[PDB]
Amino acid sequence: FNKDQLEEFKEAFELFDRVGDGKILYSQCGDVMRALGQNPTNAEVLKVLGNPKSDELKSRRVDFETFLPMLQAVAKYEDYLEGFRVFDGNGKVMGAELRHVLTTLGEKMTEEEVETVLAGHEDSNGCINYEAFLKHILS
Amino acid sequence: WXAXCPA
Amino acid sequence: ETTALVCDNGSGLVKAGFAGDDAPRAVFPSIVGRPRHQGVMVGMGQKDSYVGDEAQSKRGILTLKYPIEHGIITNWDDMEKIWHHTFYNELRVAPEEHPTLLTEAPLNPKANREKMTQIMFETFNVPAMYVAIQAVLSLYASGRTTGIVLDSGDGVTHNVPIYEGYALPHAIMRLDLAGRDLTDYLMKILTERGYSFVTTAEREIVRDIKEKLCYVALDFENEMATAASSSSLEKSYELPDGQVITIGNERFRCPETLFQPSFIGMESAGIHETTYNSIMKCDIDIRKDLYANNVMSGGTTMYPGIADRMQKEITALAPSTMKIKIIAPPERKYSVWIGGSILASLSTFQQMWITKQEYDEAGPSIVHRKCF
Amino acid sequence: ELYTKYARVWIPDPEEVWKSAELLKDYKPDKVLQLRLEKDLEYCLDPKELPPLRNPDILVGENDLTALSYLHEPAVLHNLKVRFIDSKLIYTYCGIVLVAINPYEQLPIYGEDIINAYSGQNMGDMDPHIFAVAEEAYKQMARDERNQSIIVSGESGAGKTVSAKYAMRYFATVSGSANVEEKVLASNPIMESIGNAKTTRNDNSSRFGKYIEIGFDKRYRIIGANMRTYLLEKSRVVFQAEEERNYHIFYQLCASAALPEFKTLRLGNANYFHYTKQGGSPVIDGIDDAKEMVNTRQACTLLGISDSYQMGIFRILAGILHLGNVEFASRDSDSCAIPPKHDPLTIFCDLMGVDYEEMAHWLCHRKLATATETYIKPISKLHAINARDALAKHIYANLFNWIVDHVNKALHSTVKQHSFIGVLDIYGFETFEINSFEQFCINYANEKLQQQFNMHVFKLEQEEYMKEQIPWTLIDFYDNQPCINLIEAKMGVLDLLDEECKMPKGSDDTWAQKLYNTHLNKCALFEKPRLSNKAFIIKHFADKVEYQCEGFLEKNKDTVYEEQIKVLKSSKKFKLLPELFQDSKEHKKTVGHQFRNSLHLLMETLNATTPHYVRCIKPNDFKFPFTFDEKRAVQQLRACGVLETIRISAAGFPSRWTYQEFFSRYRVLMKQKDVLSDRKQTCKNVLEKLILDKDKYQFGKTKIFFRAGQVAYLEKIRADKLRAACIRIQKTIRGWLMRKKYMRMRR
Ligand SMILES: Nc1ncnc2c1ncn2[C@@H]1O[C@H](COP(=O)(O)OP(=O)(O)NP(=O)(O)O)[C@@H](O)[C@H]1O
Ligand SMILES: Nc1ncnc2c1ncn2[C@@H]1O[C@H](COP(=O)(O)OP(=O)(O)O)[C@@H](O)[C@H]1O
Ligand SMILES: [Mg+2]
Ligand SMILES: [Mg+2]
Ligand SMILES: [Mg+2]
Description:
The complex is a heterotetramer. Chain A is mostly helical. Chain A folds into 2 domains: 2-77, no CATH class; 78-137, no CATH class. Chain A has helices at residues 3-15, 26-35, 42-49, 54-59, 64-75, 78-85, 95-104, 111-118, 130-138, and strands at 23-25, 61-63. A two-stranded antiparallel sheet of chain A has the order 1-2. Chain B is 0% helix and 0% strand. In chain C, strands 3-2-1-9-10-18 form a 6-stranded mixed β-sheet, with helices on both faces. In chain C, strands 11, 12, 13, 14 and 17 form a 5-stranded mixed β-sheet that branches. Chain C is of the alpha+beta class. Chain C has 4 domains: 2-28 and 70-135 and 335-368, Nucleotidyltransferase, domain 5 (2-Layer Sandwich); 29-69, Actin, Chain A, domain 2 (Roll), CATH 2.30.36.70; 136-182 and 272-334, ATPase, nucleotide binding domain (Nucleotidyltransferase, domain 5), CATH 3.30.420; 183-271, CATH 3.90.640.10. Bound molecules: phosphoaminophosphonic acid-adenylate ester (ANP), adenosine-5'-diphosphate (ADP) and magnesium ion (MG) (3 copies). Chain D: Residues 60-719 form the Myosin motor domain. Chain D: Residues 599-621 are annotated as: Actin-binding. Chain D: ATP binds at residues 154-161. Chain D: It is found in: Golgi apparatus membrane.
């Protein structure tokens, strides 16, 4: 990272500082990485965090300087398409089925998150154009 | 038999 | 499937039948007759020789020979005639299809068993066979595994002690006295009362008198006194020509010679004393179980009163404290065949047969090792 | 290996025979698995084993226990449990076999609309139901001229009668009709009364094989029915072990005695007569014998046995009871005699119309005839008691045959029987704390039926493999023939027992010793229990079973002295007693030999025919409606042989898929590069990529055949791929929405 990147990342980090100490919680580190363009799994975030225990994850606070090596380490389409083609073969995906899989498999998300991302993209039949949705969510 | 008796 | 033949050649009666059934279905005398007079009528179908019940029916014009004298087969082709008559005429069974079980007295020459075997395999082609000791079979008959068997047929008498299924071969006694020679003695004592039976056909009549009228005197002396003093003891019998003959003391005097062989001239003591001298050759732990069983077998033990005479004088010899029991089943004339009938139906026994393969490998010598 | 985080495995437990556990740490090849239990356990892997895996849940609950990709005990005991408890479905296939569970509760499923629903449908069209067996038997009988059998096996009370009843109701309704089923059903009271017993484990245990053959005419209307019986347990008449009873009718009879009709019989209480007394358990709860008597006579009357004959039958049974009391006083080891003026024999001869002094003479003597000459000779008190009991057995067996023949005379219809379908109710494999000659025979008849089953199934799978053009040898014949030769060959256990009866001074000690000498190390199926010289073990198909020698030489003896029968035929006091015998080697045959012969008649009757199999299980001891207990269930699933049927099916190719359904499951694994529009060849390519070894799958014309554990592996890798895709998508979206809240935070 160059000076400009370090400045933008620190500024972003400080916007997420909800206590004024120039720090975020470990549990926000992943959020900052995602806000900064990373797409880590919860497992990857915990791994770069050093698999913290619940207590230090929830209350130990780290400043930008300790977070930064983790962001660096984290920083270092066709599969995404096949992944969407998993749930198809007319190029569509049920909104109900996507809701079910997102709320029941993997690193399960809430129904509200899924409603938020799915809002306005499904048609009357309940089908999602996944290539368009993917391009939209990758921009 | 063969000796000590008739049969 | 196939059921072994069980065949006892004896002396006198052949008795034969299938294994696994209750009684012989062929019983007939082992006698072979040849005609001795001149054939006069032409076109009669006159026949070289007769066997069994035929020779009994025609005996007026025949010489009758017994092919077994003292349990030794003396003439071989008259014996082949008797076996041929048994299988084809009496049982009507082809011998190739059936194992055969054959019966013999102990301490008789080995050549007898060898010839019996060589004939059964080579000329009858019997698929398997065995040769069994007559005494051993009478315990299978009476349902025992222990006892001293006293067995007497025509010809040979023998004692064989058995204890828990082991024979004790050093203690076997054999005695040539029994059965036929009672008849030859009976002819000489009848001559004293003025009847003369010489020819071989007349002997068959004497033998039937012996079967009907003889009985064993319980005390020999008192009965000779009685019959000398009275006529109460005297019975009369009718010959085949309607003559009538009358027999007094003599009828008990005949079977007494089993108990005192001196009369006929033999060396040895009577059956009671070879029986006791046979128990005395056994070790002392088992005598108490031998005295508890004495098993009579074969037809010479069917005289009235012979069981009670045995029990009396063996009790007189034996130590005082013991039960002497004599077991004399009313069926004892057949006991050797009934025992062989049981033995040949066991499944354990199906390994014991001499099969034709082993004979073709090793020849008639095998019988001595593979059989007892 | 297959064991991973997110795995599941079955672990054994005392109180439900298996319980689920989740594999809490990935396992690497060492004596430990971390397991989580629905909380925490550590479980030894022990010599080695691994615990049985748990089937992926899309397979659990389907109609066929061979559809499971892991086939093992806890999978069966799981499917039958969920399907019975949750669905209330009581019928389930195991391959060919239908398994049926007794609900102890009525159900709507037997309604006539459903009778119509099953008719004409093949086994594929529908869920399992008993009508789906009856329908197959019917249509095969029509399709191909051969007769058909239906074979029903289970612990008594597992509903074999109700299964047969609804089976024949299917025939009556489908054919049209003539009132057979009413008659057949109405026979059951009497054949329960003469034919069943109490047993240590059961009441109304049936001790015989009942074969009901329904005849059809050339229209395939029902003509009528015959009945045959096999394998009757004759030895129970005279000997019962503790907490057993004699056949019910003796206790119905004794409990009746206060009734006027039976005043003449002089019946005592049930503890007076030596044949009822011994097992010491006169009274059953939940029944009143005195009512059951009335129900028996009422069934006799409905089947049209005149009251004169009924009083005949009860005469003869009072005869058997009184005969039992006769006592012999030995005078010698050779000889025995009856006490003078001895009352039981006086009552027997009065009941039976014979001379007191003839029976007094012939019970104690036996007669042997040469061609020319005949002897009467005495017999020991042991041989006398053996003969009295052989006469009791021979009377009872003839009386049973006569009642069955009268029932047949009322069931027959006088028309040419074009073909028949036959329904066999027979007992299953049996094991107690103590096993004795009856159990030995029952288990041998099950070894024979299990062989027939295995051989039939093997033929069917050879036909299916030729139908899919797959070389045969891949499936091969597992065979219980060495255990049958162990039992019934010459120098087998039965042969050496029948030998030991006639051998002099036979005893159970010398018998056991003969067994050890003959078999002890020469056969892998015969074993000696380590601590006893009086017992032996046979490794039957279901399990090892230990038998005591202590009974068999008493029980195995039949010999009947013909003279005692010729005495009984002379009876003129009443018609039935000579009529029973009216009818030479059979008088010599031992019980074991008659059992073999009856079993050969049965196997010839079934080999004439093409079988269909049903199995029945009690789910609990206490008749609780729709409640299921794993510890009785696993017992009966062994006893019924289902748990070896599945073991034999687990070798080979039990999992079968059509290529279309295979796409419908597994498009997800295939790249659209890999898909041809030739589907069959697509799959031939893909599966060879995905599963490395050509062994574990056979291609055939319309199906794929899989070794057991493979479809589970495919489900595992499918779930893993689908999860990985879900992870990619959801992290992408959840990162976008976090970035979108960051967009709000910059703003
Ligand atoms: N399919 C079924 N539907 C309803 N009840 C059933 C069913 N199968 C069995 N039962 C019940 O199970 C009980 C016994 O069945 P049943 O066939 O009469 O046994 P059983 O009289 O002992 N004959 P057995 O099997 O030889 O002992 C009865 O209460 C039936 O109602
Ligand atoms: N009822 C009888 N009383 C006395 N002696 C008999 C009787 N029956 C047969 N015998 C004699 O016994 C012999 C036949 O006995 P048996 O046992 O048949 O001989 P084997 O055992 O050699 O066949 C003959 O000497 C016959 O005289
Ligand atoms: Mg003899
Ligand atoms: Mg019932
Ligand atoms: Mg029943």
